[PDB]
Amino acid sequence: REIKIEGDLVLGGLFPINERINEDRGIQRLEAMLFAIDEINKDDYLLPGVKLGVHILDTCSRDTYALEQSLEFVRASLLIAGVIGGSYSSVSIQVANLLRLFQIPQISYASTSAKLSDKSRYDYFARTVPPDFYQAKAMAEILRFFNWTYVSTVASEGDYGETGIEAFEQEARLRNICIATAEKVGSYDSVIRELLQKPNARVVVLFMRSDDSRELIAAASRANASFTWVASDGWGAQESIIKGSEHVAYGAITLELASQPVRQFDRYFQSLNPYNNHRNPWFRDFWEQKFQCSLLAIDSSNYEQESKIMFVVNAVYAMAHALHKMQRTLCPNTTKLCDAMKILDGKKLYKDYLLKINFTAPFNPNKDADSIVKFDTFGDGMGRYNVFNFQNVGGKYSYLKVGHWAETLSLDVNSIHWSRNSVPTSQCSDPCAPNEMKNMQPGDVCCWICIPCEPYEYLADEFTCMDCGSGQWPTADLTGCYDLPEDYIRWEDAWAIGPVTIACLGFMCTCMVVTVFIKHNNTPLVKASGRELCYILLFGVGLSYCMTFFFIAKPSPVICALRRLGLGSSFAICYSALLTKTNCIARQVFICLGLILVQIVMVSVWLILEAPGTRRYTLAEKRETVILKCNVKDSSMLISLTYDVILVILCTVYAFKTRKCPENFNEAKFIGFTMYTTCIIWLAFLPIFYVTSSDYRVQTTTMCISVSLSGFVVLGCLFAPKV
Amino acid sequence: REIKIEGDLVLGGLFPINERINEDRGIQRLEAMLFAIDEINKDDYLLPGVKLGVHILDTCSRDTYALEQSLEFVRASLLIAGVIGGSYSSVSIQVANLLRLFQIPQISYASTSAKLSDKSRYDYFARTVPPDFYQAKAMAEILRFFNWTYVSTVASEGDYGETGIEAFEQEARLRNICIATAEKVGSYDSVIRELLQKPNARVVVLFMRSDDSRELIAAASRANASFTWVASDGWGAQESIIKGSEHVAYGAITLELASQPVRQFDRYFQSLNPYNNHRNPWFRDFWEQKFQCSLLAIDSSNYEQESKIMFVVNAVYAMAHALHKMQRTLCPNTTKLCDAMKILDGKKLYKDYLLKINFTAPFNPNKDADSIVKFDTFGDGMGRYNVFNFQNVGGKYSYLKVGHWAETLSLDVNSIHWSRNSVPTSQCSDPCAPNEMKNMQPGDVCCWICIPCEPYEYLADEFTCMDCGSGQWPTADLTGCYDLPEDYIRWEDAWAIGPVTIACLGFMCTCMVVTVFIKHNNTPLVKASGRELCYILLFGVGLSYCMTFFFIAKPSPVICALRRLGLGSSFAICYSALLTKTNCIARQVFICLGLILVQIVMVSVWLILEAPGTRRYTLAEKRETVILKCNVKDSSMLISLTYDVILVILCTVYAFKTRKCPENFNEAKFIGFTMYTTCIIWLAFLPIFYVTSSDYRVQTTTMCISVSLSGFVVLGCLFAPKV
């Protein structure tokens, strides 16, 4: 039962006027689509001369009942510069596969599918309401705002759920949002039983149908295990979806589309009676089913005005301003039909100056804020959502409007209510302390594992850990780690108590020997020996007492200069002062031959005096040791004294021959047993010197052991009863 | 000017009957579409009772003139169970966006696009001719048959070229076919000038339009540089595309679709006059423009029958057998309309038992070979092409039919004519000899580079080359390479000439010494020396003459057993036989002390007699050397004789004391100068023994040099004037 009201050029429109007569989503809209043309053809601010006409049908929500109507539009190619509206999604996808085939554009006031932006097929389809592939980029950019980046989704089955959710994951992996489970309701209440077995995912992304999101929540009062319900448009502000589960569905957020409703439309529509409406074929039919009467009037107590009445009067203007540009720019100085308005080619209509129009909606303020009825490059207006909340003040439910957003989130941050006031992160990995600073993603993203790394190591990265180098221990963190000192044995340490007492024998070395050096040269056996030779033959014993304190005092390069040079003067006193005096005694002007022989091995040390390391080093044992106090090898100083014992190897040669023939009082016993006793400790401390850790007593105490036995057992016996 | 001939159920058809009246691709086909129904409604082998009707239009090749006709089909929803034919591509894509919207299937007799298989859009479109995305999988599987795997393409601009070529490359990379250039003609003849600058690509894949492949070939007679023209369907068997370039377009291959034409159609169509054809609105109109007469008859001299007349009568049957299945299987025991033929739902018509039908074409033999009118799962019959050739016998052109193919190539291999009889590979890289066996693809595929690899290396792969190991040289190929021998100096080599003469002095060593061994013990100075000691003191000189031939004969493990043990008995004869006889002479029952001293250093060699290597080794210099004839170090045998010269280090000690006091006739001169002379060559050959390559004379000749100087300069002088 169409109505075709004539005009200079006529618009066409489809509406549900069938199920019964629908009044919520139905005939309320067709009353509004008539109401705009009563203003546009009257208000001469827009199109002055060309009077608009209307010719509208009854879409009855059945697809192949809409298409049997839709050819009666195009039997005039009552020429029609476009058709307004396909309400549902499934009725608009059928008059968008017949209205590309006549090059005539379409504007649908409310149909919000997501296959209706694939403009490779539809070159003639521009809706005003936003596509629902934006709520997969709405909530996916508030979770990264709240850092709840580990979620658990649930869809519906059919066309709504499988489109948004498959667009939700691919619009989440950019924003580092990391799903856990994925259900699909077609089970009854066991869907929560498959949901509790991931219990660090406590943010439920709910992208659901209307009534198939009632059977979940009403059966989520059985298990009584609440959550944080973030929900897409399936909730809306419906107060029946939260029917009695206020103790269960507490603390939720939801989205809906904003529409500041037209005030004077209530001045239009409530002023409409079925005795003064002859310009409609359905006001008389609706009046029966409005009140179930067999025949009152419309009050404000039964005219709760629909939330998309603004979207028809917004989207019927976006042709009437893309035609007032036509009647001026394509035909100046011609208000009426200029004979170029005869064949109105739609291809240069839609793609040229309807695609990117810009103007303001009627009956609303803030003309630069939100009423800019823009388009994108696809035929889909910008998203203007609300973010409602179930933040109950305590009345019972109290749906709360905590703000809006268009392109970036603009919340009013005092609504996050979860248990009492909780912002649950719902995060899996829980990044740990720097004590476990190997926070490495094992195989997958977003859920890493912490690991305490090596105690000689610092964290090389957020996942990596590396040692800070040989020597130094780590820091208190992964910063610059430390340094590494050496063994400072300058104090006692039960190591400076021994040779400090052994130095007294070296201090008493030059004491008793100086008595026969000058004042007692007139002894009967002072002239019988090398009275000038003994002062050189006994001066080196104090050197052995001093080279221990020259070397083993503290690590220094001058000390290592004294350490390598300290031992090189021990053995010529031990051998050349000994052996040259015995050979002339074995058979006295030839006693001068022992002078230059001391410089034989000693001058060769002067060539190696500058070759090896002198300053310092640091030797590394198992992960904590730095002591190599001078940069020399252990076998380097041992080979430096290889000729030392080799020089006193012939020191026992003259002991065997003169073992029984003393040329003096006790020179065969005190001196003959001396070289046997001197080679004993000389051979004793040699293999032990390779193996030590403190190394002091094997160096210091063994050196003075030769020094004490030298002057006492040999030189002391000649003067002990002399007194 | 439609004709609507009634029936029990009526078929619908579109045809070009406009440009003028088209007779080649036009009204000849509509005469044939009428001719089939005159048989099907008459021959009771197929559908007995339901008389077929026809209702056909005039498509006039203009898209939005076809769609103004096409609603007059669907104004009855004269119900029509499908529409036959959209001839062009651009008329079929417009009645396939209006005939999905009524759930009615379509069969197009000749339209061969490649967007008309995207069955996600078109659920109601099944053509019979093959899609032209198959000739991108036809020629792309004969080039791999001929190994011409490096090509040079050329397209046309618009819809034909850019569809097949973009399908040609993606159907070539599987078969390892490797393009070089890619033109796009919209230049005039300079397109060849951009083509000669890749002159190892001499196979021109020509995927071209009809007339825009005339301006190339007629302008390829300018440059006179021929090729191998492989061409897709743009040639066909058109004899005008090769108008006068037989010397230029010689040697080509081309494709066309096979159709064995219906013989009795000529018995039908040539028996048609415009006085006995009242069942058509266009036989009277065609009769004017057939002969330009203002009013003869159709002869066989002007009725050259069209090549797709079989494709309309093939593809009008494939409904009439998908409806004879309907009137039996959906309504048994009911020949006529069974009241389930009232609402004939097309969704259960097309997708159920028209998609996979199988039967034989009328008026053709071989009912199991090629007339199986199958479908695939897309609505596109199987490809049955011809492979024509321009193999001129010499008449002038003589288009030649060298066979066919359906799913695999079935050529008759005697047509490859390029220059005289040439099969040009047109290949880029030209894989080289195993002398350049590093045939590695540098950065890209199909064009590798050959490289001679290392002469100590063999080809590890077709691209890789690796050395065969230390020692052995490569083989004649990349097989198992070789072995590596050692230096065999068993012959002379100017190395076995020297010590073979030096062995004679070792042979004359025991000659003169044996005279005073037994027969001349009664000499006055035989008893004055060690007459039993000299036989041990001179026996080892022959050992030194023999150890050279024991060691330096040939590499053997028993020889190395004699090489390490050969030198160990040289020095005790050189020192212990010498030094013990001198010490008792330096001041005679104590002459037995020199017996056990020979076993001092010698028994220590018995402990090392089994420790180091004994068998063999091979030392590797710069890429060609294997000789380390026994597995011992150079310093190993030199340290094995370190105590050797150390034992004769004290051999010069007694020479200084006894230099002037002879206890015999010349024992101070002949023996005193001997140990000075013995240490000379002993110190001489030592540093030279570290540095040699043949190593014989430093080993053999230096050993006998000590052996000759021992007995002659010392032992020979005592008996030289004795005679």
Ligand SMILES: N[C@](CC1c2ccccc2Oc2ccccc21)(C(=O)O)[C@H]1C[C@@H]1C(=O)O
């Ligand atoms: N535009 C709606 C949107 C509809 C919908 C709305 C809310 C929740 C789920 C849901 O499911 C889908 C799925 C695909 C497309 C559209 C929807 C329509 O029915 O087409 C609806 C406002 C229109 C009206 O009620 O008049």
Ligand SMILES: N[C@](CC1c2ccccc2Oc2ccccc21)(C(=O)O)[C@H]1C[C@@H]1C(=O)O
């Ligand atoms: N089927 C054809 C094929 C046509 C074509 C034929 C040969 C060379 C190039 C070429 O260009 C395209 C491009 C896209 C689709 C179809 C074609 C048609 O016109 O549609 C033609 C046999 C039909 C007739 O002449 O009646």
Ligand SMILES: *[C@@H]1O[C@H](CO)[C@@H](O)[C@H](O)[C@H]1NC(C)=O
């Ligand atoms: C993480 O989310 C919290 C939520 O309050 C926010 O305050 C904070 O800025 C976010 N941090 C980062 C690094 O994104």
Ligand SMILES: *[C@@H]1O[C@H](CO)[C@@H](O)[C@H](O)[C@H]1NC(C)=O
């Ligand atoms: C390469 O092509 C030639 C062409 O004659 C053919 O005979 C041969 O079998 C082909 N070889 C391979 C390995 O494909």
